[model samples]
Target: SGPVPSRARVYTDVNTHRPREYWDYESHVVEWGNQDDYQLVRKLGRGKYSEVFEAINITNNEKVVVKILKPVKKKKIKREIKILENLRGGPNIITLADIVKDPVSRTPALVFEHVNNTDFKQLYQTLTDYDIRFYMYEILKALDYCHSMGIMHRDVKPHNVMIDHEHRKLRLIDWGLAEFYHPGQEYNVRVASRYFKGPELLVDYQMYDYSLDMWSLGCMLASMIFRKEPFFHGHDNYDQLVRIAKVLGTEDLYDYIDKYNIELDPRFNDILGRHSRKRWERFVHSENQHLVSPEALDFLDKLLRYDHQSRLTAREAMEHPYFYTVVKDQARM
Candidate 1:
């Protein structure tokens, strides 16, 4: 069977059956001798749910990334753990080594292989043509495999991809919000960051496929090629839409919108409305990184389709003509 279609919407999907209150999770004590776990060496950063740390895996004396959750009244511990567990050993995907508890704080932590090098953004910033090709290849390959397994990575960006120059390995990490398609269940629309999100995600239209990731890959590849954020540098969502409308123009968009039965957000009224004639030729990919090639542009146009149903699936994207001729020199990033 095909993958669950992404349901487009003007806003976040209203999950009536799901709980509205805080998630229900549990905490436990850290076991030092259980599996070669050791003390946390340093703190990396903090997020709404956890504090990431650089920890030592005593068994193999390897440095690991540990995400420790703060005490809360029931957290989303199970959901995240299950999701990561399923994606544990995927190629170019971060490895989840273990899940343990904090000995003192009674909190739980997740252990993952520590990528010693920089992130995709930083790595791409310092890369040449070869390095960019290597990175993009690995990212697309990962996307292709994940889609085959019915896994859709809602978020795809430079920050979530880690590069270890020493090992020459790049990992697509961070599955905090990933969701799997279930039979008879609707595609989840409450996932993904707006900047990297596809047009299908903007409206509650059903029957979307894995091509959403293709759009993100296109945007990300463009960012690497240009050394700037691809989209959403706009002041707000509406601003970003205006910018998008300017480049694409509204003729095809208007027709597609009506054909697919997608509803436009109220804010996009004038920019994409029937009579609007705003021009964005000056802003569309204006930086002209000089890195863009025919292959990149072709894939970008294919992936960035305004109509989700017609977007390029990851498998089809991997076989894109752009990747065909240039993959001869591709290497592991």
Candidate 2:
């Protein structure tokens, strides 16, 4: 089988000169804050890694996010802490205000600056064409900033991006799956959420880089524009690749696999029968037509490419024509 290696087209060596303590997160002595300072107001949501809640600071009555750990690995916890610390004030990055642990149970909790976030599932449906462009550009800001700092979000799904719709605020949250990137480093493919998983992950090709986020972003864009909550409907991880194959085509996928010398999993032999690439315009219809345009489709095509290197980098994506108005609006402000 081909275990060939690949590297990012950009920001591949930002970590090269940094000290070991910068990425050797396990060694960092976490200064645990006080758990009694804030009171959990209500349960906001539940995630695999933590139970997130709305809370208020008893000291100043300031609102904050209380995210309590759910019995996970300490190494994973440390990675999130180190990542939050590194990306604290970066563009659209979530701010980690404090880290608190229960004195009795010893369970750690992360405190974040409060964001008035509406669940994405409920938010995406209400966005207008202009609204979509504004938010997508905001997401790219976080991606470019994080990637430039030698970090790959690994998980760039809707649930992870908090949107304060009324204020047009977007913050990329949940650094639990995020990891620092080093050249020639092989990463775990089982990182992103199911619907957002890229083909590189499903095929067990591990030398992935920053472009992974582009694919997830493409999936999100496709879903919003086509009125499908998840554009690719896969029953499991195995079917995930097949769903992508059907749209991108079996031939193109094979060419991509050949380029990397990858031996696709044996289970795909029967399921991945011959399929031609479906035209992007086929997804447009009256219901979702408002979100689709020549520029939008072209941008979507560029991001959903089978080859990781072929996909637009976050910086390049920000320059796409679809965001012309969004960028113009920013310039005015």
Candidate 3:
């Protein structure tokens, strides 16, 4: 469905010599822990692949989140476990306290450190401009750490970022869709959610890498400052590109596709129409102007570029002017 690439793009796993075991999901040997040490309290939430519950470690009476994975291919379960283990102690990465399974059902489960997270709906409402900057900086550390370890978090969204507002703590969660990056390798275009999908994915250019996370991060930051739930609210996957084109302009999209020699799906022809790049200023209003700044707009502009290679990597993004204050304050320590 897409053109074959001639060579690898820049910054595709530019650092870290990826280990074979990191990418070998099928060969992972999971050291399963005891499920009896913990007791489930109540349901926390559910996703397509797993049901989450608030649980307590009976051994220590410590609170934790228990993720009981739904039936899926063994390799997928192994992949998640391997990736989590690989990034276990990286900055702001979710802590995998234990890995256990039900003896009778043999269903795998993951125990994670408890974060007293307020739902994004409520959390975003009360955050000041500084709060957004600080929290987003925290997330970048997590992204940078994972990317340094040669892993790309295919899913990065508000739902997957846990914020304990009271403690000003953040944790990147849900490693289910994460994968170890290999240079020039084609990946599944279906990795990310619709609104947050990168242009590389939508154009069927699968040789994407850690930069894909920057695009998803941009969508998250855009939604927060612009007061939109999903900055690009696409009706479906096909229309998702159209939604992006509506903002980025179709001409640039064409240039992006043409540059990669991507053969876009014919369906794009029906919806592809001319659109000028929507100015970020247009999104600033009485309700959200307090959170908008030149630096914020500039940061987003760099992150949301149609070209995956052009997007700021996590380390580069942390140095953006938008984070100058955060960086300065931290440096004073």
How many residue pairs clash per model? Answer: 9, 0, 0
**Tens digit of per-residue lDDT, candidate 3, span 1-333:** 456563224335543455566668799888888777888898875455558888999988999998997888888889899888889989999999999988778789999999764545458656899988998999999999988777899999888888888778888998999987777678998988898999888878888888889999999899988888889998998888888998999888988888888987898888978999999998889999998999999999999999887888898899899999998988997
Model 2 CA deviation exceeding 4 Å by range? 47-50
Q: Write the per-residue lDDT of candidate 1 for residues 1-333, one digit (tens) a residue.
A: 333334432112322233432111133222332323666788774335447778887777888888765554333556566556656677787887887765666567778888763677766766765567667778877776666555567788877788886666888877775554332346666556667766666654445556667767867876666666765454655565555565556776776677765667776775554434333232236455455666666666676667765677766766777665446545331
Model 2 clash count equals: 0
- Each model's lDDT comes to 0.62, 0.90, 0.85
For residue 156, model 1's alpha carbon misses the true position, in angstroms, by: 0.7
Q: TM-score of the candidate numbered 2? A: 0.97
* Native-referenced Cα lDDT, model 3: 0.85
- TM-scores, all candidates, are 0.78, 0.97, 0.94
After TM-score superposition, the amount by which residue 160's alpha carbon in candidate 3 deviates from its true location, in angstroms, is 0.3
